[PDB]
Amino acid sequence: APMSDVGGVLMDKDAVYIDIEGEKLMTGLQSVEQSIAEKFDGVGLQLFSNGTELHEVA
Amino acid sequence: KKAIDSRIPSLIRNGVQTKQRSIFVIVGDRARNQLPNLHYLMMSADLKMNKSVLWAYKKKLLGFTSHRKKRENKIKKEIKRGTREVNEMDPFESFISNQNIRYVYYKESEKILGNTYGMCILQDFEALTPNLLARTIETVEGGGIVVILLKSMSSLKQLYTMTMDVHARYRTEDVVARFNERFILSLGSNPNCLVVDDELNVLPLSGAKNVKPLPPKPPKQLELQELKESLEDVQPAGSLVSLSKTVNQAHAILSFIDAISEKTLNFTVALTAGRGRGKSAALGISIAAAVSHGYSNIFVTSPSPENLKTLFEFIFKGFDALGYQEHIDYDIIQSTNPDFNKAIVRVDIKRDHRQTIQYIVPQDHQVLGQAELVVIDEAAAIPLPIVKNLLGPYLVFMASTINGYEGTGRSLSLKLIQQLRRQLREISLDEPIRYAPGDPIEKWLNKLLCLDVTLIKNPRFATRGTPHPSQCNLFVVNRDTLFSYHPVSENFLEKMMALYVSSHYKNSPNDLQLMSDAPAHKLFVLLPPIDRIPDPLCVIQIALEGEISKESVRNSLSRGQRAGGDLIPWLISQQFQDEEFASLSGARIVRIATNPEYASMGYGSRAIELLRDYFEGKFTDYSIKRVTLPPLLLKLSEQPPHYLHYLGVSYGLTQSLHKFWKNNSFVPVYLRQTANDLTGEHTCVMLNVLEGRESNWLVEFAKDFRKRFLSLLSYDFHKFTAVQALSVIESSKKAQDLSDDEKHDNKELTRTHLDDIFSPFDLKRLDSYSNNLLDYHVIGDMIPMLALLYFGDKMGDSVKLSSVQSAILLAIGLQRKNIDTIAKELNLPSNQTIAMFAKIMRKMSQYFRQLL
RNA sequence: AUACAGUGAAACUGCGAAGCUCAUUAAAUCAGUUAUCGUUUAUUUGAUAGUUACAUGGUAUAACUGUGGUAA
RNA sequence: GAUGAUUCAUAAUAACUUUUCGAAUCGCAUGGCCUUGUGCUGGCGAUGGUUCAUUCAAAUUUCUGCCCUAUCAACUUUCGAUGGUAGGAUAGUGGCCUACCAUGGUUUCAACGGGUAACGGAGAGGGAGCCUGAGAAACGGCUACCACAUCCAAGGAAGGCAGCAGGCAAUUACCCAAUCCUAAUUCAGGGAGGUAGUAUAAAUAACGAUACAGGGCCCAUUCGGGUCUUGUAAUUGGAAUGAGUACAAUGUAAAUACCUUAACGAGGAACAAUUGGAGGGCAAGUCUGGUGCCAG
Ligand SMILES: [Mg+2]
Ligand SMILES: [Mg+2]
Ligand SMILES: [Mg+2]
Ligand SMILES: [Mg+2]
Numbered sequence A: 001a002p003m004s005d006v007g008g009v010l011m012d013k014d015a016v017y018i019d020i021e022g023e024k025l026m027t028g029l030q031s032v033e034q035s036i037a038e039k040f041d042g043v044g045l046q047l048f049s050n051g052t053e054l055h056e057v058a
Numbered sequence B: 001k002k003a004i005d006s007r008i009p010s011l012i013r014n015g016v017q018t019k020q021r022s023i024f025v026i027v028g029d030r031a032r033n034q035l036p037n038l039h040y041l042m043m044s045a046d047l048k049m050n051k052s053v054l055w056a057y058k059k060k061l062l063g064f065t066s067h068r069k070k071r072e073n074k075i076k077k078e079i080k081r082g083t084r085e086v087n088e089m090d091p092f093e094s095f096i097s098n099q100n101i102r103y104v105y106y107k108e109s110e111k112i113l114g115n116t117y118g119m120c121i122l123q124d125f126e127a128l129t130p131n132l133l134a135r136t137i138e139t140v141e142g143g144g145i146v147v148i149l150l151k152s153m154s155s156l157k158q159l160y161t162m163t164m165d166v167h168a169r170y171r172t173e174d175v176v177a178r179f180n181e182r183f184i185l186s187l188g189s190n191p192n193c194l195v196v197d198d199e200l201n202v203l204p205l206s207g208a209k210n211v212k213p214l215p216p217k218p219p220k221q222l223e224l225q226e227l228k229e230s231l232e233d234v235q236p237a238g239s240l241v242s243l244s245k246t247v248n249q250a251h252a253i254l255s256f257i258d259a260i261s262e263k264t265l266n267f268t269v270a271l272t273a274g275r276g277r278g279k280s281a282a283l284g285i286s287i288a289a290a291v292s293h294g295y296s297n298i299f300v301t302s303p304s305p306e307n308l309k310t311l312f313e314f315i316f317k318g319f320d321a322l323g324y325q326e327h328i329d330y331d332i333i334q335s336t337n338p339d340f341n342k343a344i345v346r347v348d349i350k351r352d353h354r355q356t357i358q359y360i361v362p363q364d365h366q367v368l369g370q371a372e373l374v375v376i377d378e379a380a381a382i383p384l385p386i387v388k389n390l391l392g393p394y395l396v397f398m399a400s401t402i403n404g405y406e407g408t409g410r411s412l413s414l415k416l417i418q419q420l421r422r423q424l425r426e427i428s429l430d431e432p433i434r435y436a437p438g439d440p441i442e443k444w445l446n447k448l449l450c451l452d453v454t455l456i457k458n459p460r461f462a463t464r465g466t467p468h469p470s471q472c473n474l475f476v477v478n479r480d481t482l483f484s485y486h487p488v489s490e491n492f493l494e495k496m497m498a499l500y501v502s503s504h505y506k507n508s509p510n511d512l513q514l515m516s517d518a519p520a521h522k523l524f525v526l527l528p529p530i531d532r533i534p535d536p537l538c539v540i541q542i543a544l545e546g547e548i549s550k551e552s553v554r555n556s557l558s559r560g561q562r563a564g565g566d567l568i569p570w571l572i573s574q575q576f577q578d579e580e581f582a583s584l585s586g587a588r589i590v591r592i593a594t595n596p597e598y599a600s601m602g603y604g605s606r607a608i609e610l611l612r613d614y615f616e617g618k619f620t621d622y623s624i625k626r627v628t629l630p631p632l633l634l635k636l637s638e639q640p641p642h643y644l645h646y647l648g649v650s651y652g653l654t655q656s657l658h659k660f661w662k663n664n665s666f667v668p669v670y671l672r673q674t675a676n677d678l679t680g681e682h683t684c685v686m687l688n689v690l691e692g693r694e695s696n697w698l699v700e701f702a703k704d705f706r707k708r709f710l711s712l713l714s715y716d717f718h719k720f721t722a723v724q725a726l727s728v729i730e731s732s733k734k735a736q737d738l739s740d741d742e743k744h745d746n747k748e749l750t751r752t753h754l755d756d757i758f759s760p761f762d763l764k765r766l767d768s769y770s771n772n773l774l775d776y777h778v779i780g781d782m783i784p785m786l787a788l789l790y791f792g793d794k795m796g797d798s799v800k801l802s803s804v805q806s807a808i809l810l811a812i813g814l815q816r817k818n819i820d821t822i823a824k825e826l827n828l829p830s831n832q833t834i835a836m837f838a839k840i841m842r843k844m845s846q847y848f849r850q851l852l
Numbered sequence C: 001a002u003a004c005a006g007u008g009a010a011a012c013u014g015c016g017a018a019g020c021u022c023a024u025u026a027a028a029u030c031a032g033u034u035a036u037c038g039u040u041u042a043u044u045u046g047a048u049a050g051u052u053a054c055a056u057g058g059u060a061u062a063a064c065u066g067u068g069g070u071a072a
Numbered sequence D: 001g002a003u004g005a006u007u008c009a010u011a012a013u014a015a016c017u018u019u020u021c022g023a024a025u026c027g028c029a030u031g032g033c034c035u036u037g038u039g040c041u042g043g044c045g046a047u048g049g050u051u052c053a054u055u056c057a058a059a060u061u062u063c064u065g066c067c068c069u070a071u072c073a074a075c076u077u078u079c080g081a082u083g084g085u086a087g088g089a090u091a092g093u094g095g096c097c098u099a100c101c102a103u104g105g106u107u108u109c110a111a112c113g114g115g116u117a118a119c120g121g122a123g124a125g126g127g128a129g130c131c132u133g134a135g136a137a138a139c140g141g142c143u144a145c146c147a148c149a150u151c152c153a154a155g156g157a158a159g160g161c162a163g164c165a166g167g168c169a170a171u172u173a174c175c176c177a178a179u180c181c182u183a184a185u186u187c188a189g190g191g192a193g194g195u196a197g198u199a200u201a202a203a204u205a206a207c208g209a210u211a212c213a214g215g216g217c218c219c220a221u222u223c224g225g226g227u228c229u230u231g232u233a234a235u236u237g238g239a240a241u242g243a244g245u246a247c248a249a250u251g252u253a254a255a256u257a258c259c260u261u262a263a264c265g266a267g268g269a270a271c272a273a274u275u276g277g278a279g280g281g282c283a284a285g286u287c288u289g290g291u292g293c294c295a296g
Helices: A022-030 A036-041 B007-018 B031-045 B068-081 B091-098 B130-137 B153-164 B178-189 B219-230 B237-242 B247-262 B279-293 B305-321 B366-370 B384-390 B410-420 B440-449 B459-464 B487-503 B511-517 B548-559 B567-576 B579-583 B603-615 B655-663 B696-712 B722-738 B751-757 B760-770 B783-791 B803-815 B819-825 B830-851
Strands: A009-012 A015-018 B022-027 B052-057 B100-105 B117-122 B140-149 B193-197 B267-273 B297-301 B330-334 B344-349 B355-360 B373-377 B395-401 B423-429 B473-477 B521-527 B538-545 B586-594 B633-635 B646-652 B667-671 B683-689
Touching: A009 B031, A015 B007, A022 B153, A022 B193, A036 B178, B007 B022, B007 B031, B007 B140, B007 B193, B022 B031, B022 B153, B031 B091, B031 B117, B031 B140, B052 B130, B068 B091, B117 B130, B130 B140, B130 B440, B153 B178, B178 B193, B178 B440, B178 B511, B219 B237, B219 B247, B237 B247, B237 B279, B237 B305, B247 B267, B247 B279, B247 B395, B247 B423, B267 B279, B267 B410, B279 B297, B279 B305, B279 B355, B279 B373, B279 B395, B297 B305, B305 B344, B305 B355, B305 B373, B373 B384, B410 B423, B410 B487, B473 B603, B487 B538, B487 B586, B511 B521, B521 B603, B538 B548, B538 B567, B538 B603, B567 B579, B567 B586, B567 B646, B567 B667, B567 B683, B567 B696, B586 B603, B603 B646, B603 B655, B646 B655, B655 B722, B667 B696, B667 B722, B683 B696, B696 B722, B696 B783, B722 B803, B722 B819, B751 B830, B760 B830, B783 B803, B783 B830, B803 B819, B803 B830, B819 B830
Parallel strands: B022 B140, B022 B193, B052 B100, B052 B117, B117 B140, B267 B395, B267 B423, B297 B355, B297 B373, B373 B395, B586 B646
Antiparallel strands: A009 A015, B330 B344, B344 B355, B473 B521, B473 B633, B521 B538, B538 B586, B646 B683, B667 B683
16 A cells, blocks of 8 residues: 555655654764764874874875 | 654665665664565565565574464464454564565575575674675665664664764773774765664764755666667577676677687687676576587586586576477486585487586596586686696686685686686676666675775886885784774775785685784784885784683683684694693794785795794884774884794695795694695695794604605605605705704614515515616515605615605605606606616615625 | 461372264164173272381472573 | 072182282361370371272173065075084173084075165274273374375474365354253363344224315116215314333343333324326427328
């Protein structure tokens, strides 16, 4: 039954309607703003023990 | 009624439109309840999607059972008890009861390799392995969904800490699990990965943050439909080419048909492709083409007949495309051997003229004298000497897989090609047949497992010149930084992994996890002299084995699961039963890899010398923060060594490798009688003692091995060339030279011992031969004892022989080879060999007289 | 209730488990009647056994505790 | 000693035995004694146990008992038919079975065979073997064999539904109370059983008042003849009550139903039964045929 709600999932137009310590970790994760890929950008890695931090591969 | 985030529906629909796969990571205890919703969205987007589902788990399912009758009985009892109404079924129970789900353990991931599934569910995150992740994802078709259920609380705490701070790694109270942590970070880079909770809230850590629904709707299909239409009238080409699924597959089949048409029996076709690209379908279709063309004696060879089930399946589909009918035009013969599991062995065809397709073991090359075609499937897994015998005066098709199953190193395929440079035709299949080309998941998987890594020639080394080995220095590689998924570390990892795969014969996907998580393992890299990312020249992976590992082992047994093993310490235990060697600490060189182009320039020896120096002490906290990264590479002095007694190696005996370890002062102590089935060479263990430590034990072991080797030349090492056998003896004797002490010394044969071994009539027979008064056959009985006495060093300084003469005596006496067999091996005519053999026996007789 | 003592899951013992559908068969079915000095018989009922001990063993395990195998 | 009758009941001798049985059990109560030790001796029950009799059953067994038949005169020894001796088995008698022996047994007084309104004994997927019990060749279980069919990760596992009830479509819901039956039993149970579910007598009306009209009806082919309180397509009054709408009690294991019984309940009594038959008559209407205005 596509138009109807089968199981708990209903699709109208292009939007789907569904019926539904860790909890603190859940909400903290949901509120994160920067992506993991972006967080890598500000990071630099030291190649040798006293070498200069290299950020991006050439 | 909660409005789902628009990203989740859009991603599934985008994948279906573009035939790209997508990854969902569901975090929460109620993650299982969200799978039915995702599957429904997948099916509604396209009704042509495959409805089969794959459920992979380690030991236990999540709160349900896959046995139907057990489920209804629990349901019926619940209904009878009144806990549930008569007809209530929550969505999850409906999802399992109706849908076609295949439940598979992680251990038995081989069974799923052939099949194709619409959705893949990986129940357990902690137990994910590189092999299980390559095998399972490859079965998902275009538009499918890969679901990974990160339900564990500890897994979530790792997820939280990295997202809060990429440097920080959550580490519980000896396995580090670096592969899983690197896996999580990689998921962020994937554009088709969404990480969601059990409420379908999109966690922003995922890479698919900015997914937007695509507008409603490929060139490769266009280049494929036109080709089929053009060839429809031209049978048998049209019917068979119709079975092709991709442009590359059709081109390969047509090229095979060209070979089948040319009828040249000195012609060879080499097919190279990745796994899942459709080689076996191409092979089976072409075999059907040769059947319809007229080839009668068609052969198929592989390591085992079971692996050919797909190839034979597509032959029959090709036969169906050609109108052949089972039990009228052809008959199927299945194996009676229980080992082959009723695998098809022979197909007999009766149309027009009698035509036969037969499976042969690769060793049986003699039967191929009447062959018109042999199809070598998975030639990578057949030993190189054996396949060379298989290249006869007949049409040859070879299929070799690159980075599929174990496959083989890419350079090995190149070395095989270089040898073939017989007329050659090379064909390559690049496009996948289950999903769209350039699928992000396949790219993400290859990066994560470093499967597609390739070696690159460095122009800078050419300009500056090749570094002299004395200039190069050895540096330790910190594993936490290497597997931190930083772009710099990732590039260095790829270069290291490139060196690994090219050199060694066989590499499994799990080797990456073993290297990352195992505590005993360490990594060393021989960088060029520092003066950009450095390009390693040689990489050494060692594993600490001995008394040091016992503390880690004892922890594992307390866990209830023994972790890993001590190969050399256990091996030396059963062979010699020496309690001391168990207590001795040592390191085993798991793998030493060098650039094949720069081989013979002395890097491999240089790195071992520096490594030997390091553990001798001649060069005398970097862990990640546990809830800013340390340097990627560490100088040798910066990290103190463990106390070790010996350096060991385990490798498949080849003349090149044996010469390499012989030159580096390694002494052989064991050699396996049973050849490795995949590669065909014998595993050899060689040990090296470090200065300042007792060396008495190694000398005793080497002496015992030499006696074992001498007697076992006749049993299973008779295949070895005589020159190779002498080298092993010579390498062992170098061990005796290492010990300056004369406490142990060979004993010259006494007259009393001489009488027992040879009777006087024999000695008279030996004298008469030297006088040329006897034939060679008369003395055949005495030769093996003479070889034992001579190579036992009982004859002493009186009798010495040349390297060629020692080879001849060893071959007759020990290898049991014929005198003519030595002639071919030593490139000497038979008459000269017998003349030399007589001269050898004169010296032995003269010595026998002198004692008397 | 200083062995337990009310009630009592599970488990071990004891007792009882003894309408339909097809075919057809003339005093071989069935009915009445006779015999068992020619027999078996739970139960009911009535009779009926003077020929370490202030109480023996596990030669004993279940339910139960806990460790696991299996798709079941 | 007992029967009509016994090698019957019973007793004894000598041995035999996978020699049986002859309370290592439980509940309630705590009396009578004294030799004060918790010393001796104790009341009512339950569960067990040998043998006999009784009861409930079972198995064989004597004699008798309505069809047509000779166009059914032999049948039986056809792997026992009739009988004797011995053994095996059975709970026992017994050709029930086995060894030896005799040649018998039914029949024209109807054997044997045939037909039958002789509904006027068998099985639980199909044959074979076995197990429990006082009682079964068990609608139970087990083994192999033969088919059917189901789940599976294809390594195995399990079934008797090859059923039942329907059609050519609601067999369900409530109980053990009533009558009986089984148990470690007053109390548990029983799809035994019980309860419910889904051609026969009435009504659609009865009784009055007033007004206004002169015709109404019967017979007869024909002409005509016979007789008298009739018609309304008029107005009007107050009474009666059933269907319904329904408060209760009774009824019952409970409930439905039945019986009994408050209040309301009629003029279009619209609180609105039918079915069939025989005749008409009408237009600025339609069609057809003609010897105007007609006929169909
Ligand atoms: Mg009694
Ligand atoms: Mg007798
Ligand atoms: Mg009136
Ligand atoms: Mg009516």
